[model samples]
Target chain A: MIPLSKVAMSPDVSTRVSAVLSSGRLEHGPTVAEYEAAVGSRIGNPRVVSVNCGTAGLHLALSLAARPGAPGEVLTTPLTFEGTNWPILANGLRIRWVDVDPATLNMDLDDLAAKISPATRAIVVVHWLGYPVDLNRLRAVVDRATAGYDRRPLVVEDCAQAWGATYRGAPLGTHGNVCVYSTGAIKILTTGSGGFVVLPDDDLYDRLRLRRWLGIERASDRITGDYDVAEWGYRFILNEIGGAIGLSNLERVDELLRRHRENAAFYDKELAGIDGVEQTERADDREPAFWMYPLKVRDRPAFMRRLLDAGIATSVVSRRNDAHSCVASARTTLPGLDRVADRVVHIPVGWWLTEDDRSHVVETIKSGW
Target chain B: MIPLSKVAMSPDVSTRVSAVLSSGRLEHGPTVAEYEAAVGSRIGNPRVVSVNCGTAGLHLALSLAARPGAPGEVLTTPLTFEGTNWPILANGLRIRWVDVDPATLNMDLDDLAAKISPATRAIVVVHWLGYPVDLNRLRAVVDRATAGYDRRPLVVEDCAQAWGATYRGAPLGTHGNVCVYSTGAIKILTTGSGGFVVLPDDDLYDRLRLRRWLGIERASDRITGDYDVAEWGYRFILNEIGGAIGLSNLERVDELLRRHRENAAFYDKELAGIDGVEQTERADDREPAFWMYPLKVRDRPAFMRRLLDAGIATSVVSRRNDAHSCVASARTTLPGLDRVADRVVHIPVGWWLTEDDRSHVVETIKSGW
Candidate 1:
């Protein structure tokens, strides 16, 4: 049976991992630096900091962007993964839900504009299902909201699913103050488990380095026995093993994304004009990496069951964040979330899906509910 | 040149890592649980949670143990690595410095007893250089400190260097309320980069598991699409690649510790009558894993330089925590620390040292200061 996601292991992963094993410099060494540089070039940002996971990257971005204490609100959408908003709460900040566009599953700019208040400290935008959010429009909203304020809210883009995606011909991560990307098993580039942040400014990059490794200055100067933690920090640094895997996979990311897009294109063409089934809309200005091909159906459960029986994999892909009891306190009206929560399902769109597999998935979906 | 520490790469590391790479279930999968079980059995604690690093383990342990708000004091010695106390500050808990025993470089029970007050919420202990602190004696001190209070300070042990060491024949971690172990490249059992926490109580284990992965409850119920973040948490979870490496290396931890002890024994015998150089005292009740062999010298800088010139590697092992600018606000007074700060150094005592290398290390130290 076809799985919803599969890690595309590069042939060179074993050799690279073996090299790291022989080097005996496993934790945050030259390999990690090389991975970071390689990711920097791909994402079009030189200021990149590799982390253990996507959530860690988001936590660091929020911790560096948000104010420590004083009860501030961070505007985010409920249509994305729970990890997108959890970092806001983890930083001791409040969450204010922003509505999503029912068609695209992207953040609604009008709702985001309406939700912004003087108390807002940050805006977290997620590119759900590898689809890019209109970064320029979101930036305009953020700029207009804090037009004359001395302390403006930082815009953080959760690009966990949009690593290779672009908004208005520019990388999704390059537009926001900080953008987090994941190289988990499911992503186009698999790192065993790894993620990173892209910062446009050099100063924030310096701060991120300290924040990633327990705020220790000159972390590599253990030989001299000289290091200091000037501020509170977490152990969010990435290691050489993941770095090696990531670098090896990243070398073939373009080919991986090409396969993913090819599968997604197949689904887009074959699944159209089917009764009681609809595809998620993508805006013309952005190009999605299509980490997963999400579709809206009248009866998602039945459709999923049928697909499973046909030897195909399907999932909701992302759950509504506010449904959980933990974030119950941050309740807000999520009409768009309610409208699509029950109908959204993601089929296999990974690089592992062969042309025959894609044809089977599309044929299974097009056969009817 | 002989290095201060090196990871003992097991013959099975390549095969195990390659298996994980091919399995494609990288993050928080079967291999991680298998590695956790392997470590739990050795440490005599069935409930263990693997994390990205030892510092991350400590951060999670401290976050679960200490009070969230209201400047609560966490009592700890300054004689350990900066990682030992950085978690205290990271959790926003005020640090109350406890003095150390100049002899063993472990926490002084008398000083710890004197410092423990109503404000103390936790007591942090470090098994410095693989030497176990008398947990029973420290527990007695903590018991007496809060004899009439509603709450007693929780004991958190930093066993980064005491992986195989035992106190009274019991593992060092089995005694504390929570104990953290490191599996970094420099540790006895290398994992590329990994660590874990051992908790006796099942309830605390549940909390730790949640805290490890961003406080998301029911983490495995992704199929149901239900999860919650009841409290703030960090992304401190370990991945499969590290787990595979850790598991492979842990199978040979016994032999690794044996070699380390053998090296330390040779040093103790040959350097016993040396001038201007003295070995740190070790209590008879405990058996140390000897992550590194610490020796006290007249002039540490000069001795280190001479050792370097002799084609041997020596270091202070861990720098004093209080010497850093960040923990300066938490500093009180450390008289015992003053006596040993300038004189302490650690010579190579790891599995990587050959018989000739061990002899050279001891002979060089015995020849002159």
Candidate 2:
């Protein structure tokens, strides 16, 4: 049986974890800083802030980007994970849905440009299933919208699934105002459970360090019996144990991404001529890490059942955000999403698959449903 | 040098953590539930919800207790870690300062009685340095305050430093409307980094489970292609690695508490005869877990330096929260805090101290500065 996703622990994972346990300095310390430095170097050395999860990074990013009140709208796509849009509402901003392109499974640039208005305070773009969005085109749209406005709307890139992926030869995180990446168990690089943000400026980076740990300006001041919080913040700091695991896993991230791409290439070639299976289109300028191999198929449930009977795990990893009751008001006619929402299914495409496993998966799909 | 506080990792910590890594289920899973169950049974079996840290628990507790923008006040002591009162400001409510008892460093019951008014919406009590607050007396004061009011003021217990302490033969966490416990690396029971809340009712417990993870109900629904979020929430969920370490540490919590109490007992007897050192008063009905051994000294800086030179560590563990710039509006004449804020220092008292270390700490303090 082939599992959908699996995290391979490094040989030194136990030793790294033990070091953190023995040090007795688990909450944000030198180890976490070292992990942040490693991530920064990998993502083009932008200022990075490590957080407990991807949702936290997005939440803090939106909190820093959006104004408090006055009915601000955050433009985003509904064809992605709920996490991509939940932070918009969590920050007290309204959601304005942008449609997705069926080919790339990324935000439709035309809709994004049409949706931007004076009321839009920010734009959130997701690199769905590790496929990078066209950041240059999106930036052009943002620049046009802010030409005569008093304030420029911030752009946040949700790169939770696109860690090693690139847009126009640059890392996805390096091209946005703020980019958030996940290192959860199933991600390209596993850290048990963790995430980080890449900030374009030093000021936001400094503010994030305080904002992640209850807004305490100087954490070391706690030892001196004095400290201050200039503003309220959440407890979203990553611990030393997670930092250790992240540092160890990051050493092999490129190899892990290579394996995923290899398996995705196999699926792309073998599943091409299958009658009921349709593959998502890829752009010439972008390269995806292929966190999951997504396909559009009729009778998705029946197809999934057949795969399950063959001992293969399959899923629709993400749901459209507007299906949830919290963001119902943001619902609009999304023709591309309506056509593919029920039909999209993700098959195994991670570092854990072996040659035989990939062959079995290809053969299973090649067989008619 | 003997450190002020240290967490002794359990022998099985590496083994337990390895299980989590090997299983590749790093996010909330069976391990977190098993850890929650262990904490629930220990703290009299209330509905337990595990979170990323104590600050996250306090923030969510205040969010659940208070209404937004209704001109409400939350009464709390200033003589505590800033993590205790910062959440009040974060929740958009005003903070009303409550004085502390000079002898015990707990909330002053008489001042608490006087402070309660129609605008008071909640009371936050901290068991400072692990000495339990008198819950029965607090309940009486809250009852009197609510005699003619439309709503009863909520009670929140900040038990970050009081993990295994008891009041009137009952656990400290069992007495409050909601109790938050810390399991960070320096706490009595170490989890690398973690915390959990004991909710008094099932309804709040359910709400918290949803609130801790971005308010997404049935997170599994993401795979099933549907979900909802009734309200905004934070990403405060604890990871599996922390849970595994917590479960391992909980096994030896009693031994850890016993070691702290033993070292505290030695200080209580020896410091009583020292001319310049004065011990804190303890009640007959309450048993403190002694996360830190406190003493009021004539010259705290000199005493700390002297101890440091002798290869021993000491500190002024916590500051008065009202001194922070963020909470200046809540500042007033806190007579009890003013008397000892500059003079109070804490000495080493934890499971990590050996017999030789304890002897050295005792001898250094006995020698006059």
Candidate 3:
């Protein structure tokens, strides 16, 4: 059966991992730095700190972006992975969710603009399923945010699923905001389980690096020595094992991303104008990583059942983040989110899919539930 | 130089790690459970959950043991690693410092006994370089806590530095208290970076497992399905990469542990009757893993300098936890802790230590500055 996702690794991934284990310098070493450098070079060379997972990256990003005085409200999307929203609560901030765009399964710019308030200290945007949301439109929303608050609300891009995707001409992480990307299983780059945060500034980047490993201090020369724990810290640092995997998997990132996009393009064209299916909107301005090819369909259950009957694996992957009771405080009527939450489903769109497989997936959906 | 600590990995650590990566099951799968099971079997098989690091384990343990009504004070040793104490603050609990015995550098039972109150919800004990603090004595102190509080203060053992040690005839973790063990870099069992918490009961254990991964609920059966996030959870999980390393290293655990103990026994015998250098007392009842063989010396700076001149690596390793400003509220004069905090230094005592090197470390101290 064709699974929704498949893991990809570089040819020498095992070799890289083996080297790290043998070297005995496991965690907090040069290997992790090398991996970070490779990634930085790829995505506009922003200051990067590798972390344990996508959630950790988001947690650190929110923690860094949080206002100094009170825990301010964070505006995020409801139609995204709960991993994307939990970090707001984790950082002692309140979640004030904006509605989704439903047509593209991204945040609705209108709701985001209307919701911006003095209390909003940060805005977290997820590029739903590797589709880059219009950042310039969000920046215009941020411009409005300037008049309502004491400080400019930091825009954090949750690029956990949009690693190789580009916003306009630049990579997702290169857009001058804090960006987080996942290297967990089945991601474009697999590191067993890992992620990284790319900070827009070096000051924030150094703080992130220090805080990731229990706030262990470093001298001006980068010599780690005596320091005091002046602030609370967490164990979210990536070790050499993750570093090695990341280093190796990075070599094949573009190759896998290309295949993913290729399959996504096939689905976009073939599945368009189908009787029961509606393709999510795309634009020439953005290059989506296409981590998953999602389609909004009527009778989602029957569609899922028919796919399984056709030996296909498909899923919504996550329930809407706002539906959880933990976030009930942030719950409000999101008309667009409600419209598409039930109907959005993802089919196999990974590098592992053969041409025949993609054609079969297209044909299966074209025939109707 | 004979460094105070060294890294050890099993025969096929790289092989196991490589296997996990190749299997494409990077995180949260059978490999992690298998490693956990192996650990469970070793430590009386108490319910176990593997996490990213020792600090994460402590955080989860504190979170689990916290009183339902209020965030109570945690009575912990100022002589311990700050990692051991910071979790208490992270869990919204106040810190109440317990003085050390100075003799063993473990928490003073008399001070612990005197400190037990209705306000205390947890007692954290570090073995201080793998010498098991008399758990029986701790239990007696806990019994005294029964009279002062609505419930007994749960003793949480910080065994991050005490793997393979024993209290009486049983392992360090088997004494019915929650135990945290680190398999981090340079630990007895190096997983590159990992640790696990052993909960005394299945109910708490299951909760820890669920909560470690966002408290996503499970049915009465082992099958995981649709569930709600009722409690706040953090990303502190151990992935398959860590598990694979842990599994491989478990094979060599005993072989490495024996060498550490062998060196410790040598130091205990050889370092005896030395003028300026005083060896910490050992017990017949406990078989310490001897993660570090700490000696309290008069003129500690001279002793350290002399050792360095002798091409030996020795250090205090850490400043006492209470010295950090983050924990200033718990500050009080800890006479016992002050007596030994500066004087204590660890000599080479690990699986990687050679007999000649340990003897050299002993002779350098005995020769005097």
TM-score of each prediction = 0.95, 0.93, 0.95
Listed per candidate, the RMSD to the true structure in angstroms reads 2.5, 2.9, 2.6
Candidate 1: tens digits of C-alpha lDDT, residues A1-369? 888877778888999999888886778689999989888887788899998889888888888656332167888888877777777866768888888888888889889998888888888888887898877788788889888888778788888888789878888667747888887777777787778989879877888888887677763577657766566577777888888888888778898888888888887888889998888886788888898888889988899889989988787755687776667777877888788888888888888887788788878877877
Estimate, for each residue in B194-269, the C-alpha lDDT of model 2 and write its tens digit.
7898888887788888878867776555665666665657778888888899999888889889989998898787
lDDT of 1: 0.81
Error at A161, model 2, angstroms:
0.9
Candidate 2's clash total is: 0
Taken over the whole model, the C-alpha lDDT of each candidate is: 0.81, 0.82, 0.81
What candidate 1 gets wrong by more than 4 Å, as runs, is A67-70, A219-221, B66-70, B217-220, B227-232, B273-275
Compute the TM-score of each model's chain A versus the native chain A and list the values. Answer: 0.95, 0.94, 0.95
Per-residue lDDT over A180-274 for candidate 3, one digit per residue giving the tens place of the 0 to 100 score: 99988888887778899988888878778777765656452111125676665677888888888888888888888999988888887888889
Over 4 Å off in model 2, which ranges? A66-70, A217-221, A273-276, A329-333, B66-72, B217-221, B273-276, B329-333, B354-356, B359-363
Residue B206 C-alpha lDDT in model 2? 86
Q: Report how far residue A200 has shifted in candidate 2, in Å.
A: 1.2
**Residue A18 miss distance in model 1 (angstroms):** 1.2
Model 2: residue B266 alpha-carbon error in angstroms? 2.3
